[PDB]
Design a protein around this nucleic acid. Structure first.
Lengths: 125, 225, 128, 187, 53, 147, 52
RNA sequence: GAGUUCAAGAGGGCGUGAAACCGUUAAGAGGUAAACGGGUGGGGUCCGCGCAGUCCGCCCGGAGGAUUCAACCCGGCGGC
RNA sequence: GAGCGCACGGGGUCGGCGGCGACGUCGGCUACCCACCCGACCCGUCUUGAAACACGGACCAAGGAGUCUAACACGUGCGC
RNA sequence: UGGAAUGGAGUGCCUAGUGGGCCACUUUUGGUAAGCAGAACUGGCGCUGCGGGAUGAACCGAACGCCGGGUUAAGGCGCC
RNA sequence: GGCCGUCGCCGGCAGUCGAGAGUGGACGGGAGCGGCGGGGGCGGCGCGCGCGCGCGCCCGCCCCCGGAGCCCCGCGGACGCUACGCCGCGACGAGUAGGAGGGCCGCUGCGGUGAGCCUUGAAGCCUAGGGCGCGGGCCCGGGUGGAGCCGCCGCAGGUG
C-alpha cells in the first residue's frame, strides 16, 4: 500500500515545510529534500539512506529490512563505513546495485555520501 | 537470440535505407516530369497565338482557373453579408490570402466582397514562392511549417500528392483533388506591402488597389514577401 | 560560502520598477500599494497614453529565471540549524537566508554550519 | 487582429475533470495510464465515467442488470457498472451474474455471491481484462431522478405535462384556474 | 426572479420573534437534572419498583 | 464559511452585485407574493397554473386517522415473510400454501402490480382490488378478508 | 486487506510475553481522510458555547 | 551642573510615541501653479569588492614525499 | 564484399580568438533620494454625454456598510 | 451519401445586469428649420484605448499581453 | 524573433521513437551465394555496405542486470515521475454593468504540527539600506523599543 500511505501524507502537515515557493521534506531516510514519493523512507518497503556517522568521522548507511513486519525497533539495519573517499562510494555503489535493492537511489545516494564526507574535513574550496 | 535479433536491426535499417532511396528517385522524376509539362503548357500558348495571327484570326485565351485573394481591410466596421463571405474564403485577418478556384459559384462570391479584397491571377512564380516561403500546413488543426516531404505525404497520400513539388502543381493546374490540397494549406500571412498601395478605399480600375487586377497581382505578391 | 552557482543565466527583467496606484498627488491617505482603478471616468483604467502603467500578465518573468537573486541563487528562510540540512543536497542553487528573530547567540551556530556544508548564506554575520 | 468569437474557446469538459477521495484517486491514476497507452475505448469510456458527478452515475438496479444480461449472445461476459448496484426485492428469480462495480449494496452483495456468481472491483478488472475485452457495459437510468419531472416546457402552457412545484398535493392547491375550464382558463 | 415554489412563510410578525423564545441550550443540562431526579427518587422508595406502579 | 462566500471576492467593486444603472433598492415591486393577479400575472400563469379560485366540498373536522389505508403492491408481497417460508414449496411442513398477513405488516389494501411467483398463497388483508384478486387467484392461491 | 498477521503482546517490563492476539479486522478498513476530516470538523463544533 | 535607575530617548496625565502640521540642520533646485509616463548629472548616502579573479570541479603524466595495517586476494567472525 | 570524411547553403551559436584598467577607483536591471532635458486636464457618482461653469472632497489617524444571522424553498457538487 | 467553400456538432439545468439610450451613409413621416421630434437596414459610441482630422464620443485607418527589427493604411513631407 | 498567460491537441511520460522505423517462441523436410518477383507505374511505402557494439562447431556460456550496453532502458535514475507532478506542439489575449476560476495575497481566534523563534532581546514604530513577485504583499540589514510571536495542515469570522 506504498501508494496509499502516500496519498494520505502527500500534503498533510507531517514533515513538509513550504516557504518561498519551494517544497521540502525532513525525514530520516530521504536522500534529498525537494523531491517526494521517491525518497521518503516512512512510506516505501525498501528505503536506503545515507547520513553522517555519530562519531564525527565517516558516514553511515541505513537499509530497511524487508523480512519482518513493521517492528520499528528492528526495522532498520545500520552500518558504519570509514574508508577513504573513493572506496566509500564503491561500498555504497556496490550495496545498492549488486543487491538489486531499490536501485532508483543508486545515483542519489552516492552524491549524498560525497557531501557528507566532504564536510568532514576542512572545506576544500 | 542475439544473432537473429542482430539481423533484425540490419534488415530494418537497411529496409529503411532501401525505402528512402526508392523515394528519392520517385520525387525526383516527378518534378522532372512536371518541368517538361510546365514548359510545354507555355509554348502551347505561344503556339496558338502565332498560328492564328498568320491566318488573320484572333486567339482568345482561356479564362483562368485560379485567383489569389488578398484581404486589404481590417475587422472594423465589416458588414454582415461581407463578414460571412470572406470568412468562407477563410480570410480572417488583414493581409491574409488563399488560392481560390474560379467558377460561377465563386465569382459571384468574389463580387459580394469586391471592396474588401485585391485579387488577380497568380503566375507560376508566385505559386512557387507562396508555397516555398509561406507554406504552413493544417495538420491536426495545428499549423506546422512544411520543412519536409513526410508532412505533405502523411496528410495527402490518398490523392497521389506526396511532395512539395506536387503540392504546387495541383494548386496551379486545378486538379481532381484541388479542394483538399487547397485546404491543407493554412491561410498565408503576408507582410504589409512595401511601397504603399496608393489607396485602399477604391477599385483598381480607378487607379487604386482593390478589385480584379487580372495579371498585376503578380506584382503585389512580389512586394509582400 | 559562495560557490560558483550551478548555472548563471542572464537575469533580464521586463520591469519591476514599482507600480504605484493612481492619485498619490498629495494624499498620504492613499498608499503606494496598488489597487486597480475601478472608476467610470478614470483616465488610468481606460488605458490613456501618458498616464501611469497598469499591470497585465505580460510583465511576467522567465519560468526558469523567476525568483532568482542577483547573485544566482534562490532564497530559503531558515530558522534553526536543523532546517539547513535540507539544503545539503540542493546547495548549488539555493541560499539559506536567516530570519529576523534568531538571537545572536545561535546565529553564529547557523553560520558556522553553512561553512561546513558549503551552503551559501546571503546574510552572513550581521550582529556581533 | 482576427475576428473570431471566444464563447466556445473554453470547454467545460477539459483535458481532465475532477476526482475526490484517495481510493478513487488511485483508480483514476490507474485507468488513466490504461486509457492513454492502450489503444482501446472501453478504458477511455470508463475513465470519462470515473470523473462524473454522483448525479450522473445513478444506481443500477439488480433487476435492470438481469434484463440486460439476459439478452441473446450475452452470457459469459462481466458486466461493468461505473456507479453503484442496489438490491431489488422485486426479483424473485436466481441470477448467475459476474459483476464489476464500485459499490455493491449489502443486500445485493448477499444475493449475487449466494447464487454462485462472482463480484469484482475496478482493480481486479484491470488485471483480468486490461484492453476491456469480454465486458458488457451498462449505466443506471440517468434521467430517473425525481427532478426531471420539473424540467421542460414550463407548466401552464398548452400541452406541457410538467409537474409544478407546490407546498403539497390536495384539494385546493392544484386546480383553481388554469387546471379546469369551469374557471375561465385551461391549457 | 420568481420561478420556484410559490410558498409563503410564517416569521411575519412586525413585532419581534424575540419576545418569544429562540434558544434550546438547556437540554444537555436539563437531561442531567432529570436523571438526578430519577436517581434520587429510585433510592428513596427503596425496594418497590422504580418504574412506578 | 464566510471565507468561501463570494462577497469576500467582491471587495473593491463599487457595488459588488446589483449593478449601478439601477441600484436595486430596499424592495421594488411588493413584499412577498404581492401583485400576482395584476402585475405579476405573467409569472403566476406559467409557473403555477392553478392558484386563484377554489374547488368546493369542504370537510370541516378532517380526522386523517380514519382514512388511514396504506397499500402494498403484489411485487413486494413476498417481502413481508421470511426466507425460510418462501423457499419451502414442499419442504419443512409448508404444504400446499403458506399464509401472508398484510394487516400485520402495516398495510391494508393489496393493490395489483407485477408478476407473482407461482406458489399458492392465502393473502389476508382488510381490502383488495379487482386485478389484485384476479392475479392471486390465477397463481393458485385464495383471497381472504379480515378486519 | 486479508490474512490478519499475529500481534505479540508485551508485558509490564517490555520483553514480549508469550501470548499472542490476532490483529482485529478494524485495522484493515479503508482509510479515506476526507471522512475523518468531515466527521471531525463537525464533531468539533458541538462543544461551542454561545457568544453574542 | 551633580544624582537615583538596567533605562529618564521611564521625571511625578510619566509603557511604546506613526500621520496630518511645525522649528532647525544638511543636500538639490526655482519666471509658464504644484504634481504625473524615458536617459544623463549629482548622493551629508549606502551596498559588494578591489593592488590579480594561479575561480572552482572531476580523470591522466610528472618529479618529490608519507602512511603502510594499507590495494589485491585468502582464512576467521557477524549482519543483510 | 568498406572504412575514411568535407559534414551541411544541415533536427534554432560558437570560437582548439584576443586587449585594457585595477588601494584614491570599479559595479548597483534591480530600485532608491534630489535635479536636468523629452510626453501629459481631478478623483467618486447620475448620465447617451465629465475636466466640466454638475454635485461630495482642507489634511491625518482610527471606526465604517448590497451584506451578517435564523427560517423557507430551488438547483449544483461532496460523503453515507 | 448525390452542386461550390468553411469547422466539430447536439443537448439539460441555475441564472446576476438591462429594460432613460445616442450618432452616421441610405430609405423616410411632422416641421420653414432645428446640435428637433418619430420609424427600417447596417455599422459605430455607451463598454474602446491607438495613428490622422490643430482641438473633439460618433468621421478616415485600425481593434490593445511586455518587447527588438522591418514594412504599411488614413494622413502627409517651408519652420513649429 | 524572445518572453508571460489562457485555451485547444479526447496530447507525451511510469524513464519516449512514430515527422510512414510494417511484431514472437518452436516444430519437420528441402534448405536461402541477403531481405515477401506491388516502378516510366512515373499514383501513400519494396537496395549497397549485408550476415560486428561484443561475443560460438572439430568447448560451453543468449553471456550471473562483471551489464540486454542503452546513440533509449518494458526489472531498470535525465534538471525530471511533490502524477494535484514534469514535458512537447500550435491558435489566441481590450473591455464598464455582470459571472466564474485561481491567490505560497493579507487580518483575528481554534484543533493539530514545526524537541519552531524569544531578555546573547518579541510585538510594534522609523528608514537616502539589500532584494523577490506583473500584482495583492513578502523577506533580509540598521535604529528605537522592553515580552511575547510566526510557518505548514484544516477549521471558524464582527476581515481589507
Amino acid at each position: 500500500s506504498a501508494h496509499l500511505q502516500w496519498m494520505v501524507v502527500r500534503n498533510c502537515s507531517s514533515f513538509l515545510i513550504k516557504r518561498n515557493k519551494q517544497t521540502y521534506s525532513t525525514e530520516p531516510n530521504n536522500l534529498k529534500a525537494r523531491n517526494s514519493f521517491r525518497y521518503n523512507g516512512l512510506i516505501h518497503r525498501k528505503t536506503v539512506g545515507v547520513e553522517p556517522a555519530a562519531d564525527g568521522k565517516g558516514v553511515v548507511v541505513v537499509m530497511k529490512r524487508r523480512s519482518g513486519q513493521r517492528k520499528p525497533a528492528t526495522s532498520y539495519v545500520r552500518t558504519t563505513i570509514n574508508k577513504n573517499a573513493r572506496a566509500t562510494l564503491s561500498s555504497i555503489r556496490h550495496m545498492i546495485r549488486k543487491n538489486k535493492y531499490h536501485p532508483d537511489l543508486r545515483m542519489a545516494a552516492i552524491r549524498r555520501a560525497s557531501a557528507i564526507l566532504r564536510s568532514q574535513k576542512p572545506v576544500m574550496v | 537470440n542475439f544473432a537473429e535479433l542482430k539481423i533484425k536491426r540490419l534488415r530494418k535499417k537497411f529496409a529503411q535505407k532501401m525505402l528512402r532511396k526508392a523515394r528519392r528517385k520517385l520525387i525526383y522524376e516527378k518534378a522532372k516530369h512536371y518541368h517538361k509539362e510546365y514548359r510545354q503548357m507555355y509554348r502551347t500558348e505561344i503556339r496558338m497565338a502565332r498560328m492564328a495571327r498568320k491566318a488573320g484570326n484572333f486567339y482568345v485565351p482561356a479564362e483562368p482557373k485560379l485567383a489569389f485573394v488578398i484581404r486589404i481591410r481590417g475587422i472594423n466596421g465589416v458588414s454582415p453579408k461581407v463578414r460571412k463571405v470572406l470568412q468562407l474564403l477563410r480570410l480572417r485577418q488583414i493581409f491574409n490570402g488563399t488560392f481560390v478556384k474560379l467558377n460561377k459559384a465563386s465569382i459571384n462570391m468574389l463580387r459580394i466582397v469586391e471592396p474588401y479584397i485585391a485579387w488577380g491571377y497568380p503566375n507560376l512564380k508566385s505559386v512557387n514562392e507562396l508555397i516555398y516561403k509561406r507554406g504552413y500546413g493544417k495538420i491536426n488543426k495545428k499549423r506546422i511549417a512544411l520543412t519536409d516531404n513526410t508532412l505533405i505525404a502523411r496528410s495527402l497520400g490518398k490523392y497521389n500528392i506526396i511532395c512539395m513539388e506536387d503540392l504546387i502543381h495541383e494548386i496551379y493546374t486545378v486538379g481532381k483533388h484541388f479542394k483538399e490540397a487547397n485546404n491543407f494549406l493554412w491561410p498565408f500571412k503576408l507582410s504589409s506591402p512595401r511601397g504603399g498601395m496608393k489607396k485602399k478605399t477604391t477599385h483598381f480600375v480607378e487607379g487604386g488597389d482593390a478589385g480584379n487586377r487580372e495579371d498585376q497581382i503578380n506584382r503585389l505578391i512580389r512586394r509582400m514577401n | 560560502a559562495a560557490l560558483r552557482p550551478l548555472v548563471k543565466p542572464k537575469i533580464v527583467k521586463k520591469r519591476t520598477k514599482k507600480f504605484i496606484r493612481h492619485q498619490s498627488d498629495r494624499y498620504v491617505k492613499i498608499k503606494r500599494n496598488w489597487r486597480k482603478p475601478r472608476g467610470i471616468d478614470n483616465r488610468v483604467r481606460r488605458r490613456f497614453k501618458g498616464q501611469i502603467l497598469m499591470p497585465n500578465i505580460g510583465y511576467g518573468s522567465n519560468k526558469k529565471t523567476k525568483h532568482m537573486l542577483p547573485s544566482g541563487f534562490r532564497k530559503f528562510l531558515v530558522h534553526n540549524v536543523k532546517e539547513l540540512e535540507v539544503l545539503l543536497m540542493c546547495n548549488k542553487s539555493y541560499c539559506a537566508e536567516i530570519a529576523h528573530n534568531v538571537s545572536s547567540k545561535n546565529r553564529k551556530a547557523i553560520v558556522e554550519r553553512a561553512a561546513q556544508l558549503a551552503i551559501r548564506v546571503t546574510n552572513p554575520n550581521a550582529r556581533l | 487582429g482576427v475576428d473570431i468569437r471566444h464563447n466556445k474557446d473554453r470547454k467545460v469538459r477539459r483535458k481532465e475533470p475532477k476526482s475526490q477521495d484517495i481510493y478513487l484517486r488511485l483508480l483514476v491514476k490507474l485507468y488513466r495510464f490504461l486509457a492513454r497507452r492502450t489503444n482501446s475505448t472501453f478504458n477511455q469510456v470508463v475513465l470519462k465515467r470515473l470523473f462524473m458527478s454522483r448525479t450522473n452515475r445513478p444506481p443500477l438496479s439488480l433487476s435492470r442488470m438481469i434484463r440486460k444480461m439476459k439478452l441473446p449472445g450475452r452470457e459469459n461476459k462481466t458486466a461493468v457498472v461505473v456507479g453503484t448496484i442496489t438490491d431489488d426485492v422485486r426479483v424473485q428469480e436466481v441470477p448467475k451474474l459476474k459483476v464489476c462495480a464500485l459499490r455493491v449494496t449489502s443486500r445485493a452483495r448477499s444475493r449475487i455471491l449466494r447464487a454462485g456468481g462472482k463480484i469484482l472491483t475496478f482493480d481486479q478488472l484491470a488485471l483480468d481484462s486490461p484492453k476491456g475485452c469480454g465486458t458488457v457495459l451498462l449505466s443506471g437510468p440517468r434521467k430517473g431522478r425525481e427532478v426531471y419531472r420539473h424540467f421542460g416546457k414550463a407548466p401552464g402552457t398548452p400541452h406541457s405535462h410538467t409537474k409544478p412545484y407546490v407546498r403539497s398535493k390536495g384539494r385546493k392547491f392544484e386546480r383553481a384556474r388554469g387546471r379546469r375550464a369551469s374557471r375561465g382558463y385551461k391549457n | 426572479a420568481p420561478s420556484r415554489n410559490g410558498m409563503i412563510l410564517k416569521p411575519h410578525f412586525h413585532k419581534d420573534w424575540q419576545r418569544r423564545v429562540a434558544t434550546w441550550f438547556n437540554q444537555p443540562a436539563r437531561k442531567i437534572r432529570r436523571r438526578k431526579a430519577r436517581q434520587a427518587r429510585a433510592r428513596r422508595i427503596a425496594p418497590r419498583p422504580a418504574a412506578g406502579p | 464559511p464566510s471565507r468561501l462566500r463570494k462577497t469576500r471576492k467582491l471587495r473593491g467593486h463599487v457595488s459588488h452585485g446589483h449593478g449601478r444603472i439601477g441600484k436595486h433598492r430596499k424592495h421594488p415591486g411588493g413584499r412577498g407574493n404581492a401583485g400576482g393577479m395584476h402585475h405579476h400575472r405573467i409569472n403566476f400563469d406559467k409557473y403555477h397554473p392553478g392558484y386563484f379560485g377554489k374547488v368546493g366540498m369542504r370537510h370541516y373536522h378532517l380526522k386523517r386517522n380514519q382514512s388511514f389505508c396504506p397499500t402494498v403492491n403484489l411485487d413486494k408481497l413476498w417481502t413481508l415473510v421470511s426466507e425460510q417460508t418462501r423457499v419451502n414449496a414442499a419442504k419443512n411442513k409448508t404444504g400446499a400454501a403458506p399464509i401472508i398477513d398484510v394487516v400485520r405488516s402495516g398495510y391494508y389494501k393489496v393493490l395489483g402490480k407485477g408478476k407473482l411467483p407461482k406458489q399458492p398463497v392465502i393473502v389476508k388483508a382488510k381490502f383488495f382490488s379487482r386485478r389484485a384478486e384476479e392475479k392471486i387467484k390465477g397463481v393458485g392461491g385464495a383471497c381472504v378478508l379480515v378486519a | 486487506a486479508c490474512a490478519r498477521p499475529l500481534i505479540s503482546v508485551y508485558s509490564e517490563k517490555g520483553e514480549s510475553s508469550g501470548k499472542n492476539v490476532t490483529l482485529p479486522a478494524v485495522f484493515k478498513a479503508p482509510i479515506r481522510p476526507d471522512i475523518v476530516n468531515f466527521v471531525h470538523t463537525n464533531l468539533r463544533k458541538n462543544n461551542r458555547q454561545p457568544y453574542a
